[PDB]
């Protein structure tokens, strides 16, 4: 009697705070943007990138040195303006929102042609994460209030919190890809690109860093968001001056200095680059028994799948 009641009382008392729910990060990008290589490097692997992308799943483990806690970091990704919410809604659940972070990768090749891709994916994530905080019917939402106040008091750490330029309730880091093309851009094009790259970071309060092979900052900064996988914050100064490397600590990039909105984007868009069938009929085809059976199969299988009454 009292033996199990107390045992129950202890597992009830405990349960607030192997490791506690591990974090995971999702990679917004395009298809064949080089982002697969970036992810695989975050896993500290040398494997050739996979062509396809359909919520690819991979993870790894880290230790601390006093022990091996087996800190697992999960990785999810999607590329291109394909099945936006149908797939974005899959790896993201409200129960783990506080443990969820985004990183957005942009191919420098054609920022304009890539902009609707990342924008659509980003909107899908933004809308989704905003809802799941209470869509689950989380009555005891105190945690929801706490975690939101954390996110919107991490970047305006010291600077007076004048306004939340865009309430964005999930961590975000932004980075380009294949900067090898940037050195070959026209001076005028590099400048207008810099305006938007600088702006978008401070707009979301998302840090920036470069991407290369010898560049350890990529692994380091990614590691921080990935459960300190490659160290700690190690906040450095903004590199808006050199423009050769890339690095921005969110909070030091005040608009008045880095930009010096709608008009900014419109201007950069116009200057940088403005030029931004299934045949179900099967008419040139014929068959008699093959098409008759296919019609039969279609009906019978479709009705069977409905009858399964799956809750999924």
């Amino acid at each position: 009697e009292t033996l199990w009641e107390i045992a129950k009382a202890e597992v009830e008392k405990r349960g607030i705070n192997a490791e506690i729910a591990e974090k995971f990060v999702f990679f917004i990008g395009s298809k064949n943007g080089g982002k697969t290589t970036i992810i695989l490097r975050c896993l500290d692997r040398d494997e050739p990138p996979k062509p396809t992308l359909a919520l690819e799943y991979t993870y790894g483990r880290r230790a601390k040195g006093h022990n091996t806690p087996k800190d697992i970091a999960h990785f999810w990704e999607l590329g291109g303006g394909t099945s936006l919410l149908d797939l974005i809604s899959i790896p993201i659940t409200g129960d783990t929102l506080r443990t969820f972070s985004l990183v957005l990768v942009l191919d420098l090749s054609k920022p304009n042609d890539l902009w609707p891709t990342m924008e659509n994916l980003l909107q899908a994530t933004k809308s989704h994460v905003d809802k799941v905080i209470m869509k689950l019917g989380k009555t005891n939402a105190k945690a929801v209030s706490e975690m939101r106040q954390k996110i919107w008091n991490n970047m305006p750490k010291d600077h007076p919190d004048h306004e939340l330029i865009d309430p964005f309730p999930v961590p975000l880091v932004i980075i380009g890809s294949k900067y090898d093309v940037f050195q070959d851009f026209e001076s005028e094009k590099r400048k207008v690109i810099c305006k938007t790259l600088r702006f978008v970071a401070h707009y979301y309060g998302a840090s920036l860093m470069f991407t290369s092979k010898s560049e350890a900052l990529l692994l380091k900064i990614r590691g921080v968001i990935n459960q300190l996988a490659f160290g700690i914050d190690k906040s450095k100064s903004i590199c808006v001056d050199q423009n050769k490397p890339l690095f921005i600590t969110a909070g030091l990039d005040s608009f008045g200095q880095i930009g010096s909105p709608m008009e900014l984007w419109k201007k950069v868009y116009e200057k940088l680059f403005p030029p931004k069938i299934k045949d179900p009929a099967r008419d040139p085809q014929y068959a008699e028994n093959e098409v008759d059976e296919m019609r039969i199969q279609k009906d019978l299988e479709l009705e069977q799948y409905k009858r399964s009454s799956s809750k999924s």
């Binding site: 008759d292 039969i296 009705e303």
Partner: protein
């Protein structure tokens, strides 16, 4: 093909309903209401079995070739099967 023929048959003023009973009283296709669909499939399943037994009892080397049962309300026809048969109901009037 078969679906088009069934529709054409159903369009005939004589036909009052068609049931495709597959797994021994379990239908998949019907042009009738659910209570009648289930009852009719069951009844004709039992009924045809009785006729087949009757024929074998008359002669131990012959099976059913066709079975028809008539009533004042409607008339029902079934055919022998290996795996499943089909049910047709018509108004003889």
């Amino acid at each position: 093909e078969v679906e088009e023929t069934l529709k054409r048959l159903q369009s005939q003023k004589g036909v009052q309903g068609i049931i495709v009973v597959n797994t021994e009283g379990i239908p998949i296709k019907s042009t009738m209401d659910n209570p009648t669909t289930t009852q009719y499939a069951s009844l004709m399943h039992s009924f045809i079995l009785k006729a087949r037994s009757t024929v074998r009892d008359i002669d131990p080397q012959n099976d059913l070739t066709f079975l028809r049962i008539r009533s004042k309300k409607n008339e029902i026809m079934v055919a022998p099967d290996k795996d499943y048969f089909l049910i047709v109901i018509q108004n003889p009037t």
